[PDB]
């Protein structure tokens, strides 16, 4: 008759997990290499996916922490003394403008909350509430997008969470300054409904529930084959 407090939904699902690692440069190059983008979802990290897909419906708040580490870049014309690096982190709600390049107008939109962060301080954090039209997120959706019974199968538009975009505020004239971003994601005030059997087959697609047939368990020698045995000894005489 010992405690069960560690098996509750809160203590089971509120563990921070690293869900994205990206890199971006601070100088000339291909524009797509000068910013980092991520669409918020729980279907790309298999370890977190297996935990969220024990329940059919979920309702939680998001807490996102960004760890940013920058270093100098080898080449010619190295910077002898740089003041400090500042980074801009922008959260785009569902339906907001999304940048197609760095130094775009969407970076200065008043509907997108942004964080300006200087090197040396504590990691930046933000919290997003339960932002959806429906009354819950749904891990499994059996249905179509249009009512013609045709379209994308298994896609629901009621569980969009937005995007995260990170770039360098500074304009650098001497040298390049590569930076690396890590995203830590955590649910809070979690509520879950309608439990489901955990998955057996390995994941094959982030968008689908497709699978390969897998054996229901691990093989055994015989039906009456108990595990191994013990040799004769002082107790067994």
């Amino acid at each position, epitope marked *: 008759y010992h405690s069960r407090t560690e098996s509750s939904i809160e203590n089971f699902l509120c563990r921070a997990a690293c869900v994205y690692i990206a890199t971006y440069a601070s100088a000339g190059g291909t524009p797509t290499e000068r910013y980092a983008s991520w669409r918020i979802n729980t279907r790309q990290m298999v370890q977190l996916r297996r935990k969220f897909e024990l329940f059919t419906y979920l309702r939680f708040d998001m807490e996102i922490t960004f760890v940013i580490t920058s270093t100098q870049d080898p080449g010619t014309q190295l910077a002898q003394d740089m003041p400090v690096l500042t980074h801009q982190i922008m959260y785009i709600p569902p339906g907001g403008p999304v940048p197609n390049s760095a130094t775009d107008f969407a970076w200065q939109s008043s509907t997108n909350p942004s964080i300006f962060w200087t090197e040396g301080c504590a990691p930046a954090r933000m919290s997003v509430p339960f932002i959806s039209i429906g009354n819950a997120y749904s891990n499994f959706y059996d249905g179509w997008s249009h009512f013609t019974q045709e379209g994308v199968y298994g896609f629901n538009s009621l569980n969009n969470m937005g995007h995260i975009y990170v770039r360098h505020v500074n304009e650098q004239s001497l040298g390049v300054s590569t930076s690396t971003l890590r995203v830590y994601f955590k649910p809070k005030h979690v509520r879950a409904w309608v439990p489901r059997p955990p998955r057996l087959s390995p994941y094959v697609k982030s968008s689908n529930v497709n699978f390969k047939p897998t054996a229901v368990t691990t093989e055994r020698k015989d039906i009456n084959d108990v595990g191994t045995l013990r*040799p*004769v*000894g*002082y107790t067994n*005489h």
Partner: antibody
Amino acid sequence: EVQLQQSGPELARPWASVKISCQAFYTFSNYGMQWVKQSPGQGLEWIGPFYPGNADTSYNQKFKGKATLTADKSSSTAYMQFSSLTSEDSAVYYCARVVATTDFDYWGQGTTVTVSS
Amino acid sequence: YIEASQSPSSLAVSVGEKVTMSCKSSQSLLYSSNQKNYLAWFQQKPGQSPKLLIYWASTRESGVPDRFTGSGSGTDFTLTISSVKAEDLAVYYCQQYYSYPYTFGGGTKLKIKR
């Protein structure tokens, strides 16, 4: 290199009790005494172990309900009784002793139990 | 420990002469409740496995020729062969299976006299 002896080979008759004794030169604590069957036709087959210091006696299923075992630790003599004796059971019975839980170190001398009906 | 003493020497007689031997036990070998004598006369061919002749001192083992007859009640135990053979060379023990331990006899070589 300790020697080992037994009761000895005697010419018996069918359905006549033959007790094959075995001498000892050790103690009687958590050790073991047993035998085999030395017949070229039947190869080597154990008959039953006896465990001084453990009070355990077992027989093979091939002779279960036919043979019995007894011993006297103080007297240093171990019996291996047999019933419903046949004529093809003749073998050079070897007395095996183990001073360990799991080993076979010292072997016997040799005794014959051949009969004529 | 309970042991038994065989004859001081071997048979050392001619071939074809009946031989009588005795086994002197150091303690009683009769269980009065069952009237059973727990001792047997053994025989070991040199190089092979041993094999007894008669068990319980009154029941000859099946397959044993009629030449061997074991007797003796109480502490004493004897045996008789009405026809000794030159192909029966072995070591004769008188082993007891009464109580722990199962001690053997003393040994008896079938030597050469011819």
